[PDB]
Structure 1
């Protein structure tokens, strides 16, 4: 009955850790008056915002998230924003509470969010079982280290309804089994046609703005005595009953820009208040680019001997390393212009800092490792007689080590690096290829390591002893598809992506892992 104004600004956030938020001015016919509509924290559950274009769906979302942010710090509240419209939730990306920001085409990013949520819900259910509780409200009441509330904010659900099936199933899980774990879901939507019942029924609070066709309103909420006028912000908010309400604006302002300017100021203020509070981490993602300098410093946390860091795990964004103690040898398998020489550089850079006794470097055709020559540990090999000298010199040391081993108790690395296997078998005979193969099965435990790079066909072409010995090596770095090499039997599909310089596969023990290889320069 009482006339509702067209524009109202929300009250100032003046209650730390509030349990109720004024989101709009509602008509209360039972009193024939007006008062704030208070959304109950946790209890009122997930929020579904509906209405036609231009009637305040995204505006309501902004008022909610900014209100919650004023009461809780980024350690208590985490935002995951899915902006599947026209960047309506883009400003909120600067909120300290915003853990990550997702877009409609962020396919890799979204799939990793799903992985995180599945694990996070698992961990939370396991933390509850220890405290013998079933609610985060109970857990955070009996715990020293409290769990942060997670909110999945999704704008424009219309694109999920059709274009993204696998992602919708997860959203249904979040809405159905999320409240108890501390995970809540707020979403806007225009067309309510294909919103499944297990999602709609888990949207306890429904904020329904004006619809051009009254049919959609009847689908969301039941029959009502009152209807909403075509006024932006005007809505029927149903939880138990529908209350005619004018939703509050995100901030003060006589027009849109003035409001948006004040919103930006408020977010700067929250940034000042919560400055001493740690902000949530984003979903573990691989960097756009990766240099050896960056990889060595900010990623390699542990620099232990006998371990060779070769790249970043795609899934965990953590460095995978070669265990020289359990896998003394390694193959660099790849294709034309894929990253073979660069991987060799990574191994060499990982060496030279572990105090090797000697490093025999047999460069390839292009001479792309001539810069590593003349170093105080590297024996750059060009000629055939020079190679024979290094092998026989390595033979002497490894033989004495065998005599030092028999004498005393149960080694600094003696390393033989081959940038090109094709070039090796082009400047040597099948007899010397047997000598190298012999040293591998005789001195492997005495600190002798080999690293041979080359294209996939180079490892399967030969019938010689060296080829036979190399195809028994279980550890490898693949700068090629798993479906384009005959050395290792690895699971794959036709839909596996193509490899490009900067990526590859870390292979050991019959298992593999997509890795990001740093660029050495």
Structure 2
């Protein structure tokens, strides 16, 4: 009934036509009527009462677009992933298929990184790349959901037919595959990426976005996404009681012969090796691949797979939107979610607060915002006052807006006194129409921006800024603005001191940078951890918490 156990696995060249260098389709089956129709051979299969094994093929155009792979330790999960990718790469061009890998299973997908079809591979370490890789594809899905509707794209097949012309630019992509090696490792260390990838699998198959997910056990997949995996390839399972084909058929699956697995129909299949040389051995696997990847890379002289756009180490402030296009809104950086600008609006929320450790970019951020205010406000519209003990804001305090600079504890007290008196005069009288309160009619003048750097050392026992605490929640009516930066040193117990207490109470915008988790939560829901220079969690209780990268101002 079943064929006797094979002793050597097949290779991709065995299960494919004579391969040739094409101009320009890369090293593929030149002219084949089955090339580029999103079918892929992944090994040999033994159907009952067959006397010769047939080539195992998978159709990835349509409902079976998502692929799931299961199996116990060392059962051949990671090799199946590499075979599927290589097989697709042999029958397609980099402009037709793209791969983005999250390798949590032995980190062996790195060998396929130099494939022109692959644009990103992320190890367990590269959290920044991991978190961004998913967000990149998630943004492409949303992009196509509007691109297809604005144009005459009814189905994904139509889109491929247009790019088949060679006269259609499209969105720059083809069929995109999101590959994960250990789904358990993901949902454990990246809980947010579990639900997001799941949402990709839900409605993304009709837009050319595929998910290829691997894991030790089927139960490690939530029902929400496990059912979305149309094509399921099940290898030798520990605890076969949770098999998706048959329990008793899974218990008789050969152990210690990796590659052996079952289909949903119960057929016996064997995973082929990702080689095109002909060597059926597996102890020569690291080197088979290299030659193959090299051959695919050499034969292709066109565009490669689009890379995952990372958050820059240093973000030039010249990139952020000018005052002519942003208005009174002040861009301070871009977010990790979509690489879109992140604005500040002092007409919506008066104050702003920064937390950060040594040399994380606090003083640089204050110089940015101040320069942004200068660029957007005439000195008759907004005046500036600096409390700068460490003299770090010299570059932006030479403007005509500046009508106060305190570099000493004494100079601070002399200013706040004139400040408290000047602002108390703007306090709204008891009897006022709501329209008078809305337009701020009873007083005419400029807005007052109080910029404080290193609040940690101005907040002694006799904090000179404390006399302003009682009128801080009245800022919207008097036109007061406090922009404050502080270190992480004792920042936790600094949330109860008169000023920061009331600033945080007003749900004021702010971000936390490179702090120690010993300090506990400061703003919103984020517990601080070591971040790169300029990076911080932008907390805003309108748009929740977002990881952003702030800009760098020269000199």
Q: Report the TM-score, using the length of structure 1 for normalisation.
A: 0.68
- How far residue 10 of structure 1 moved from its aligned partner, in angstroms, is 1.2
- In the alignment, what sits opposite 2:175? 149
Q: 1:416 to 1:159 in 2, by over 3 A?
A: same
- In the alignment, what sits opposite 2:317? 296
Given that 1:69 and 1:97 are in contact with CA atoms closer than 8 Å, whether structure 2 keeps it comes out as yes
- In the alignment, what sits opposite 2:117? 97
- How far residue 64 of structure 1 moved from its aligned partner, in angstroms, is 0.7
**Residues 250-301 of structure 1: CA deviation (Å, up to 9, x unaligned):** 454465574323423433444445553153242x6534x43xxx5235x436
Structure 1 vs Structure 2 CA RMSD:
5.1
Given that 1:77 and 1:97 are in contact with CA atoms closer than 8 Å, whether structure 2 keeps it comes out as yes
- In the alignment, what sits opposite 1:35? 54
Secondary structure of the corresponding residue to residue 276 of structure 1: coil
- In the alignment, what sits opposite 2:77? 57
Equivalent residue for 2:285, pick from 217, 241, 259: 259
Given that 2:100 and 2:119 are in contact with CA atoms closer than 8 Å, whether structure 1 keeps it comes out as yes
Q: Report the TM-score, using the length of structure 2 for normalisation.
A: 0.65
Q: 1:39 to 1:130 in 2, by over 3 A?
A: same
Q: Distance in 1 between matches of 2:276 and 2:75?
A: 17
- In the alignment, what sits opposite 1:14? 28
- How far residue 158 of structure 1 moved from its aligned partner, in angstroms, is 4.2
**1:365 paired to 2:379:** no
Q: Distance in 1 between matches of 2:410 and 2:129?
A: 42
Secondary structure of the corresponding residue to residue 317 of structure 2: helix
Q: Where does structure 2 lack aligned partners over 5 or more consecutive residues?
A: 14-18, 20-26, 30-34, 427-442, 509-521
Which structure is larger by alpha-carbon Rg, 1 or 2? Answer: 1
- How far residue 155 of structure 1 moved from its aligned partner, in angstroms, is 1.1
- How far residue 355 of structure 1 moved from its aligned partner, in angstroms, is 13
Q: 1:103 to 1:459 in 2, by over 3 A?
A: farther
**1:426 paired to 2:413:** yes
- How far residue 195 of structure 1 moved from its aligned partner, in angstroms, is 4.3
Between stretches 5-14 and 502-511, larger displacement belongs to 502-511
Given that 1:433 and 1:464 are in contact with CA atoms closer than 8 Å, whether structure 2 keeps it comes out as no
- How far residue 52 of structure 1 moved from its aligned partner, in angstroms, is 3.4
Q: 1:460 to 1:141 in 2, by over 3 A?
A: farther
Secondary structure of the corresponding residue to residue 80 of structure 1: strand
Q: Where does structure 1 lack aligned partners over 5 or more consecutive residues?
A: 380-393, 395-413
Q: Distance in 2 between matches of 1:180 and 1:459?
A: 62
Q: Distance in 2 between matches of 1:311 and 1:419?
A: 28
Q: Distance in 1 between matches of 2:539 and 2:236?
A: 58
**Residues 295-323 of structure 1: CA deviation (Å, up to 9, x unaligned):** 235x4365859776533445443444568
Given that 1:208 and 1:217 are in contact with CA atoms closer than 8 Å, whether structure 2 keeps it comes out as no
- How far residue 14 of structure 1 moved from its aligned partner, in angstroms, is 1.6
Q: 1:310 to 1:275 in 2, by over 3 A?
A: farther
- In the alignment, what sits opposite 1:310? 332
Write out aligned runs for 1:353-432 (5 A).
Answer: 364-369=388-393, 372=395, 378=398, 414-416=401-403, 418=405, 424-428=411-415, 430-431=417-418
**Residues 346-385 of structure 1: CA deviation (Å, up to 9, x unaligned):** 3566699999999988673333456x49xxx937xxxxxx
- How far residue 497 of structure 1 moved from its aligned partner, in angstroms, is 3.0
**Residues 224-252 of structure 1: CA deviation (Å, up to 9, x unaligned):** 59965446454244254514435234454
Q: Distance in 2 between matches of 1:81 and 1:176?
A: 19
Between stretches 505-514 and 304-313, larger displacement belongs to 505-514
**1:87 paired to 2:107:** yes
